[PDB]
Each structure stands twice: as structure tokens, then as C-alpha cells.
Amino acid sequence: VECFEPSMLKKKQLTVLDLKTRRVLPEIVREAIKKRLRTVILAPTRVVAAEMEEALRGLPVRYMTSGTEIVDLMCHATFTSRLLQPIRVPNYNLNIMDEAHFTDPSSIAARGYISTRVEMGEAAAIFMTATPPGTRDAFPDSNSPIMDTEVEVPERAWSSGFDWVTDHSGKTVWFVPSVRNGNEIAACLTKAGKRVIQLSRKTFETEFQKTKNQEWDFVITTDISEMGANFKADRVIDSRRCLKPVILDGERVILAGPMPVTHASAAQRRGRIGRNPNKPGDEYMYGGGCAETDEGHAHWLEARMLLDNIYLQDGLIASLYRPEADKVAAIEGEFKLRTEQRKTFVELMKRGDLPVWLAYQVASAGITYTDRRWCFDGTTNNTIMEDSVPAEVWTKYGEKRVLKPRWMDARVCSDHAALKSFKEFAAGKR
């Protein structure tokens, strides 16, 4: 609940610790070592993993990010990846997930595996988050009072009518629905004389350090900053919008929206500020309402794809964490692959860096990892565009062909670097 007690470490217990790194995590870790409980600590990002190392200095933690530790620490994604691969992973007696609201498929699957293990009676778990899966509170308490204001927020370059944006003399974190959208606002700001840092999923791990090392006026970020990113800011501007990956007719993935964020997302975005007890009056400006946009969101179907392929016990398939389990319509076990296709599936996701859903379509079709023929033999309306002309690649055979994947997932080309990565894939370069 609000305070940790040693009883939470008992098998069969699952606790949502709302709302840390603190001396709280070290407290938990000390209690776990004293009880000789084999423990995992799951961090959302490497940035958070490094922060954790700092707080846990002196404690026997194996950082998978003496030689003899009984506490392991790794990223959410790493845990789930190790589960899916042939790799032996301990049946941890205690599972600690930090920023346990993370809606990445790997994170959802991890919650599912972990929560099933506690239901079986095999482990305990602690899910640490200010915004539990399921929450409807966009305005949770904070360390210091926040001034909340509903206002029209620009989503395109502007010149007049938004003076409050540029008249501010402090530091602002501005949440946008997409990289491309952030690029436009960033350009507008920079033209206006501001110093801007941009953050997204693919750049976060390396670019977040700029917020410490460089002067800045605005951070333009996608939803990746909802996962414990700490800024020394006094204002958040929140579009209150996101893109929603959606599977259409079981045959394609589109990026729907922009559309309203969940209450959890809004709460996390706002929670970037109001954090300093000695600094009341941080500002949260928000530009729309919330909605349950995690319903029918592809990430929870992708989570099922992952979990269907993780062994737990003969004949058993882990269920999603119950508060999240209605976000997807699927039959448990429907995505279970046989050993060789599973291996292909994993390789497409890791080395291939393909979205889960796409990796599944390819693997389930009996295509081997290196066989890229599918990247070119799709229908005309699957052609991927580059600067409003069909995108082209040289195949590993040396033939120039139009990128036209058999299965279309919009995430493969939603911004320049995504397209650059998929073109390299289609070319057989990884």
C-alpha cells in the first residue's frame, strides 16, 4: 500500500507499492538478503538501473545490465527475453518491479508471468508505481502542490496565440504523441530562441544524459519519459495525446490517433513535476481529457504473444496481471509456437528489432530469420513510402526493389530512423 512491511515478502503475496529508489528499495533488499530470498529487481530502463546501482551500493547485487549474489537486477525487457530463450532463469522467490505501470509488451508479459507465479504459491512480488494498472486518477498526490491548468496546447508550429508557452523562464518537459510531432514543435521552439532536447524510446538511453550535461529550456519527449525519468523542471506541458497501435482485421498494424492518454499516463506525465517539497507551484498545463485507450491497444495482444511462449509448468500458460487482463481479446495459448518457430520469433524481435506482432506473423508463417523475401512481396497498398515516393532497397542479391512487406506494421516506418532500420533489415544487413 503506502509503506513496505517484511510480511510482503511471504510467498503468495502481491503488493502494489504506491507510490522508492530512496532507502526504500535498499530496505527491501536488506530484508530479502536477511531472509535468503532469491530476488529479482526489474528496472524499466538502463537509466533507472544505473540509479538503482547508486542506491544499492554496498549491497550484494548482481547487475545484469563476489561472483556470488542472490539478488539480481535487470531491465523488464531483459527478464522477459531471458524467459523466452533457452536460458535458465531462477524461479525467484521475490520479484520487485519498479515503474510497474510500464506498458511495453515485455513489461506487461513480465507482470503476467510474475503474478501467475505468485498465484501458484511459488513467489512474492512487489509492483512499485504511482499509477497502478487500472487507475482513474490523473491528479494523484505530490510532494509539493501543483498548479493544474486545462489549456489549448499547440501540436503544430505556431506564431501567435500561445505566448504563455514561450514567456516562461524556467524548464519545461513537453509530452508529445510522436517523434515526428515532437520534431515540429522542437523546430518551432528552437526558432523562437529556446534550447531543446528531444527524447524518444530509441534515443532515451543515450540522450537523457544531455538533460544533466547541457543547458536546456525545453525537453520534448514521447511517453518514454513516463517511466521514472527525473528532470529538474518546473513545468510540464502535456498534449494529453498519444498514438495507439491497433491491429486491423488481424492483418495489419496502424498507428491510430493521436488520441487521449490514459489516466495513468497523464498522472505520470504530470508527476515529472511537483517533486520538490521546498518548491511549490510547479505548473501542469494539459490540452485534453483522458480515456481508456489501452483497451484494444496492440501492446496487450503482443504481451500475450510473448507470454504464450514462456514455459511455466506443464500445460500452463500464464495469464496477464488481472487488472490488465481485459485490455486484449485473445484465447490463452493461441500464440504458442513450436521450438524452432519460437527461436525465429525471438530472433526477429531481438536481432531483427521488429515489433512483436510483426515478428510473430513472420515466424508463424514458417519463414526463417534470414529469409527476407516477405519484405518485398506484399500487396501494392503495403508499399512503404520515403519522401512521398516508394522506398527502395538493394536486396542481398543486389537487386533494387520497392519495400512492400507482406505484413504491414506502421511502427516499422513511423519516423526516419524506424524506416532506416527496416530498410537495413529488408536488405539483409542484420
Side-chain angles (χ1 to χ4, degrees), residues 73-334:
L73 183 147
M74 62 189 83
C75 284
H76 299 188
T78 300
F79 179 70
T80 56
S81 176
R82 289 172 76 88
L83 288 165
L84 274 162
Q85 302 183 248
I87 300 168
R88 27 172 167 341
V89 315
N91 190 353
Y92 296 101
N93 309 134
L94 173 55
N95 307 82
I96 302 158
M97 181 180 266
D98 189 39
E99 306 298 353
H101 58 279
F102 195 10
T103 64
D104 247 64
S106 277
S107 298
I108 302 159
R111 268 175 236 133
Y113 178 87
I114 286 161
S115 67
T116 294
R117 286 259 175 228
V118 342
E119 194 177 349
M120 290 163 52
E122 293 195 347
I126 292 170
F127 286 175
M128 308 183 143
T129 179
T131 59
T135 181
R136 292 186 191 145
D137 185 2
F139 305 96
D141 292 344
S142 55
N143 283 341
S144 172
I146 295 169
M147 303 219 200
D148 292 313
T149 76
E150 183 186 274
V151 203
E152 188 76 23
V153 176
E155 291 191 41
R156 302 280 188 280
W158 69 95
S159 46
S160 65
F162 300 93
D163 286 356
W164 63 268
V165 173
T166 46
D167 281 347
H168 193 266
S169 65
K171 280 187 145 153
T172 301
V173 179
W174 185 334
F175 287 87
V176 296
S178 70
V179 169
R180 294 182 183 174
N181 192 58
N183 289 156
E184 173 160 357
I185 284 95
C188 187
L189 289 168
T190 58
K191 221 225 197 40
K194 301 303 180 181
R195 292 157 301 185
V196 185
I197 297 159
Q198 288 179 82
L199 311 177
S200 63
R201 221 194 356 117
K202 43 159 177 133
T203 66
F204 183 90
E205 296 290 4
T206 63
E207 196 91 344
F208 175 75
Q209 181 63 17
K210 283 179 160 60
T211 63
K212 303 174 192 155
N213 189 238
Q214 289 176 203
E215 304 281 5
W216 56 271
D217 305 306
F218 287 81
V219 166
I220 300 312
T221 54
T222 59
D223 69 328
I224 192 56
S225 284
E226 284 166 27
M227 263 54 61
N230 301 322
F231 308 93
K232 282 158 193 47
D234 47 30
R235 179 172 74 168
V236 162
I237 293 177
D238 189 359
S239 59
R240 291 272 187 103
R241 316 297 265 171
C242 61
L243 291 176
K244 183 187 150 80
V246 174
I247 299 157
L248 288 202
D249 312 313
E251 77 177 15
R252 74 186 36 257
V253 177
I254 61 171
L255 285 162
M259 73 180 61
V261 291
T262 57
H263 302 269
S265 287
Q268 288 289 353
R269 289 179 181 197
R270 174 171 149 110
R272 296 312 88 197
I273 49 74
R275 289 189 154 183
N276 188 341
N278 296 327
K279 188 135 270 202
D282 282 355
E283 293 182 332
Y284 177 70
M285 339 293 288
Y286 61 97
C290 301
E292 289 176 299
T293 55
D294 287 346
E295 311 263 5
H297 189 301
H299 281 190
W300 278 269
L301 192 140
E302 294 176 301
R304 283 254 50 101
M305 293 173 161
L306 302 175
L307 256 194
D308 274 0
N309 287 282
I310 287 173
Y311 178 81
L312 200 140
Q313 189 176 93
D314 288 349
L316 292 220
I317 292 279
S319 292
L320 299 178
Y321 177 40
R322 168 178 198 73
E324 301 187 271
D326 300 326
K327 296 181 164 84
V328 54
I331 317 132
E332 281 182 4
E334 123 175 56

